[PDB]
Amino acid sequence: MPHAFKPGDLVFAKMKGYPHWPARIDDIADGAVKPPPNKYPIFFFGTHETAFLGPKDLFPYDKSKDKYGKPNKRKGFNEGLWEIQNNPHASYS
Numbered sequence: 001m002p003h004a005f006k007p008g009d010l011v012f013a014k015m016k017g018y019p020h021w022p023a024r025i026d027d028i029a030d031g032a033v034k035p036p037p038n039k040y041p042i043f044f045f046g047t048h049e050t051a052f053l054g055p056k057d058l059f060p061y062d063k064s065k066d067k068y069g070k071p072n073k074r075k076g077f078n079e080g081l082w083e084i085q086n087n088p089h090a091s092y093s
Contacts, residue, residue, distance in 0.1 A: 002060075005040055010061035010088050012068040013042045013053055020059060020068040021077070022084035026050065046080025048092050 005011075007027040012020035026041040028034055035041050039052040059068065061084065069085075071078050083092070 005055060005058060008089060010084055011042075012059045012061065012064050013044065013051075014057045014059065015051065015053070019072050019074065019077070020064065022046065022061070022069070022080040024084070024088055025058075043092070044076075044080065045083040045088070045092075046076030046078070048076075 005025050007025050009025045011023050011025065013023035014020050022045040023042050024045070026043045028041060035052040039054050040058070042051050042053045042058070043049075044051070061069075069081060071081070083090070
């Protein structure tokens with residue numbers, strides 16, 4: 001059975017006007033800006049951008065990859081597909 005989301009989990013994260021995007025739940029470093037209540041820090045692979053999203057926009061990677069894990073024209077997307085599959089827990093700092 002599913003648990004709640006935790007740092008390190010891999011997802012496709014959905015934002016308005018973008019395709020479902022390879023991403024991970026990030027840790028919050030000591031001294032770093034915390035997300036709002038009920039939101040998670042989402043690190044988007046490829047673009048290496050962070051947004052704060054809630055679970056309704058988070059699709060677990062294993063379940064969703066057959067649907068969403070396909071090349072896309074958008075900038076950083078295919079780079080992001082490589083990262084989530086090949087080194088999803090690396091520092092992209």
